[PDB]
Write a protein of this length. Structure first.
Ligand SMILES: [Zn+2]
Ligand SMILES: [Zn+2]
Lengths: 82, 97, 94, 144, 108, 54, 81, 96, 93, 105
DNA sequence: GAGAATCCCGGTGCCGAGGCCGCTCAATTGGTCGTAGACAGCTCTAGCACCGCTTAAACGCACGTACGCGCTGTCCCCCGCGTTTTAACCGCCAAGGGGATTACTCCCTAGTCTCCAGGCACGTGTCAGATATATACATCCTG
DNA sequence: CAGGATGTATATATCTGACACGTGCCTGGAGACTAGGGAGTAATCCCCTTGGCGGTTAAAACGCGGGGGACAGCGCGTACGTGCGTTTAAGCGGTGCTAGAGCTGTCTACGACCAATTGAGCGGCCTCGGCACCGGGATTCTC
């Protein structure tokens, strides 16, 4: 079983450089937990649809097209993966 | 000695990261996070590398958009420091919560 | 002269089963009809897309199960799936 | 406008007559006569043509068909001419005399890849001498 | 005289028309062919959802000392339930109004 | 004179490829006919939208 | 022909809308902004509705056409068929 | 006898949050709809039901926008909504 | 050997027409393919909905033109409709 | 045999578009001019996007079009940005912009 | 406590919802066949797992400085109210442009068959991008 | 303002590897043909829309006065960016395994379909009762 420590894998410098790309000047210290909570929610929403697509396909692995369809059904179409 | 005043390094980081297209998160911890999340929906699932890359691309784009919106909100609050109030406001307005 | 169709009768029957002593306005009935049509369209479209994705040509109970799981959130989806499975089981037994 | 363009082109043609080709109103319809250019199997032949100018000319290509029978892959029995500048590569900046020169060039070099009579293109590709001989026969038969 | 009238809904103990659902599916250009259990499952799902909405609306109406369900009652029932609110967050209901709430900052 | 109509240039329109023609002939042969340059085939559709918006 | 009908949306009407929205105090410049926003929204909806009608080849805009126009913008509306 | 400012505002907020009636005058709204529709096809005709549906959708949209802009104004730590608040709400919602 | 199909060849031809001396990366080609597929799906779905609304059974150029008007905005839609009408006219002729 | 695209002077495969239409179960029957119209529309859109991307690349002093160039071309054009407002492009990055407030005064 | 606003009990009608009456049109039954789908089996490709070495990224700490936050004066703009003004609204009635059906016909599209050619999977060379580095070049910052 | 500190884009070079290129092959596109049904067209009916009227009046507009709240300012604390020194997993790479993905081939349950039967719902027609209304008493919030 994979432990819950993986949420800490999204490092503070990684979040900081994401904010830098987004155009943020400076970041409060309380953000870094809010951001990973938001990321966890978003990933749960996408993966829930991906895995059910795979289950309906009766496969044991998750393909790229499953993720593409899951994103498409949420109005988040992704180009570059067929 | 030599000491850049605060802000200049932030501005040059903004310019640098707004000019490149590389991923900003580490592949291995992102994969571990994805596998941890997915194990509850169904155990012992396997993933394609392209699938993980697509997930990471989508997540990074979503976070960048959210950060742009929250920066706009913080500026609207007559500030320059992003704080979770701004993130919550942007999430609520965009109908995500 | 076009004989339009709606679900007013069945909606009324379900309402009588749930609340035996409650009326429903005419404009409310139209809202219920629109809601039923919207849900039907969503589920049917999702099932059709699933069948096309799996390179299939038949819409079966499994596709509708998956479409319901995709659309309805959480507890609502669980209860709906339970109800649909029970109905299909009873229909097969009959 | 279109009539103005026709009159201007007629005036320029009168001022700049070509060596062999000639055409004129017989305004929006012109009769064209071209001499079979030398160094070709059609050398010496006199070919007559009909020109039909569209109402939006020069912004649309004109309708021109051969009225003299000729042995050429890109020309059918009805006189139709398979020409890109007649169908796709038309430009309003073009002139009728340029079209005539292009026709002469195509007569000197048929395009077997996009012909109107496939048999003529077949003869052209399989036996150049046979194509030249039959083309000269047709030029003498109908254009002389 | 082939058999007594036993509708597929009666077989499944449903109230929605299984035959009508099947006809709509095969007439809706959704797929080349339609399976046997698909109309049954879809009718069951629709019946359950309508029952849920009607139950919530009836509770809201009885809480308002009224005996007839109205679009206001439907709007309140949808907004109050989190699941239905999320399902129909992009849905506008005529004569529905809004869920009555005021921000605490405005209150003195 | 217009490169096409040869009449006096009334509000002449200059292409980004440095080619110019009268506004009537321009609208007749580029705006609604070609979207390519009458002289050097320079396609101007995006330029056309940009200048139409302004 | 007619013009300047946008002023028909009165300041008290906008105020009632904001009150239903749960607004306690309203600035003086909100009204022109609301006029512009409503004009843009109505233009966007009516363009699609008119496109639907003229595709159907008739001169009358119908409730079903308006409903379709709203639906195609992710703004589903109930109570009109 | 005068009420303090904001009290009648709160009472009318409570009043309007409970009723389901339309808050815009039907005749000028219809005139506006026809005036806008003039720019696409002349001499068009409208069904009363179509106009009512348009009014319902417009009122719902404006109420939602006002909710969002009030939320933003509160976030700015003040109680008066302002055009900058409206612009922020619309920009975040992606309408512009 | 499931021979999969894309639009790479036609996209490259269009690129040659527009910029005769410019190349395109392989990954950009995949993005163009995804874009073409997405736009095609949008237009076809809208045309199908139009045909169903009008109780028709055939998709003609009318439905496609209306769907394009619904989807593409402003001058983009204007140019697209002009191109489609021109192509249909030329094909008929 | 002359292809329908050649007849229409297009580049996209009219036959392929027709086959996709009849296999997509969009309608029971398909008109003759619909594939032509759709192919023309797709060709025009691709041409527009490619022209913008090529201009972006030449402004960047490069000769190959990349997803970064595609993203720049889409975001810079208002019409295309509106059309593809909810589209994520892999390896696309973001349009470089800094709020003027953050700049020093 | 006084004044203004709000809910409810009470009798009434009246109009909008519930039950009745064909009958017909859609749901059902049964047979039948073409077939999409299920199952078994085989091959093998990509995902999973691990080792080891490098090091660039992550992490921890000091600081000081710029920013957030709180307080305070002010003041001007927004709310509440009243009087006046006006256009919405209701009722009513005339005119008709236009929406919905019917028939029919016919012209368009589906279907099949044959032919082939243009697109796909496959080698290639060659040519555009990266790396390295020494420049200019620009910018900050502290004087 | 200016020159050193310090990033930063560049011109040049060579590697290199990603893409434009020629090749064999195959299936999907084009074509001639016929049949059949979708719908384009005309004419028809009626009906819902437009326009108009006049009369009421509730709603909107204006203006006045007051107060509260947005705003500029100021002072103070603190926490976050910046840098430097210390870990440490990410990445590479490399290997080895195997399980699940993809495929082909067999077999068959099953859905489409047709013909006949029949009854459930649509339309209409009642009957009555849930609720809006008008009045007033009881209640409550604010100044
Ligand atoms: Zn001119
Ligand atoms: Zn030019």
């Amino acid at each position: 079983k994979v432990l819950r420590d993986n949420i800490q894998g999204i490092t503070k410098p990684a979040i900081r450089r994401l904010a830098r790309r987004g155009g943020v000047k400076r970041i409060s210290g309380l953000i870094y937990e809010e951001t990973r909570g938001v990321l966890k929610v978003f990933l749960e929403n996408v993966i829930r649809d991906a895995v059910t697509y795979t289950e309906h396909a009766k496969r044991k692995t998750v393909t790229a097209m499953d993720v593409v369809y899951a994103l498409k059904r949420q109005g988040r179409t992704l180009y570059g993966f067929g | 000695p030599h000491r850049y005043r605060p802000g200049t390094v932030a501005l040059r980081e903004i310019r640098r990261y707004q000019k490149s297209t590389e991923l900003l998160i580490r592949k291995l911890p992102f994969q571990r996070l994805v596998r941890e999340i997915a194990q509850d929906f169904k155990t012992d699932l396997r993933f394609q590398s392209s699938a993980v890359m697509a997930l990471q691309e989508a997540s990074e784009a979503y976070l960048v958009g959210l950060f742009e919106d929250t920066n706009l909100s913080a500026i609207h609050a007559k500030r320059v420091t992003i704080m979770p109030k701004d993130i919550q406001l942007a999430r609520r307005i965009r109908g995500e919560r | 002269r076009s004989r339009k169709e709606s679900y007013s009768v069945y909606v009324y029957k379900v309402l009588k089963q749930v609340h035996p002593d409650t009326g429903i306005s005419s404009k409310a009935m139209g809202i219920m009809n629109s809601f039923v049509n919207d849900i039907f369209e969503r589920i049917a479209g999702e099932a059709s897309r699933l069948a096309h994705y799996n390179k299939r040509s038949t819409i079966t109970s499994r596709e509708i199960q998956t479409a319901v799981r995709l659309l309805l959130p959480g507890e609502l989806a669980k209860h709906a799936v339970s109800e649909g499975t029970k109905a299909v089981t009873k229909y097969t037994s009959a | 406008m279109a009539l103005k363009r026709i009159n201007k082109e007629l005036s320029d043609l009168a001022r700049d007559p070509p060596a062999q080709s000639s055409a004129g109103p017989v305004m929006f319809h012109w009769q064209a006569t071209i001499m079979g250019p030398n160094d070709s199997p059609y050398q010496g032949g006199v070919f007559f043509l009909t020109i039909h100018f569209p109402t939006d000319y020069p912004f649309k290509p004109p309708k021109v068909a051969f009225t003299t029978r000729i042995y050429h892959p890109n020309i059918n029995s009805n006189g139709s001419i398979c020409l890109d500048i007649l169908r796709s590569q038309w430009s309003p900046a073009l002139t009728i005399s340029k079209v005539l020169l292009s026709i002469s060039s195509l007569l000197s070099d048929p395009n077997p890849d996009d012909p109107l009579v496939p048999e003529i293109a077949r003869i052209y590709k399989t036996d150049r001498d046979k194509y030249n001989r039959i083309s000269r026969e047709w030029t003498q038969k109908y254009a002389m | 005289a082939r058999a007594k009238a036993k509708t597929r809904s009666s077989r499944a103990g449903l109230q929605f028309p299984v035959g009508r659902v099947h006809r709509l599916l095969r007439k809706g250009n959704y797929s080349e062919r339609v399976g046997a259990g698909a109309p049954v499952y879809l009718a069951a799902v629709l019946e359950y959802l309508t029952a849920e909405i009607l139950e919530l609306a009836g509770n809201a109406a009885r809480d308002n000392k009224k005996t007839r369900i109205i679009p206001r009652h439907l709007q309140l029932a949808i907004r109050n339930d989190e699941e239905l609110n999320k399902l129909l967050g992009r849905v506008t209901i005529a004569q529905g109004g809004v869920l009555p709430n005021i921000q605490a900052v405005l209150l003195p | 004179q217009c490169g096409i109509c040869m009449e006096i240039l009334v509000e002449p329109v200059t292409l980004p490829c440095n080619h110019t023609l009268c506004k009537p002939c321009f609208q007749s042969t580029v705006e609604k006919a070609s979207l390519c340059c009458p002289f050097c085939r320079r396609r101007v559709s995006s330029w056309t939208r940009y200048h139409t918006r302004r």
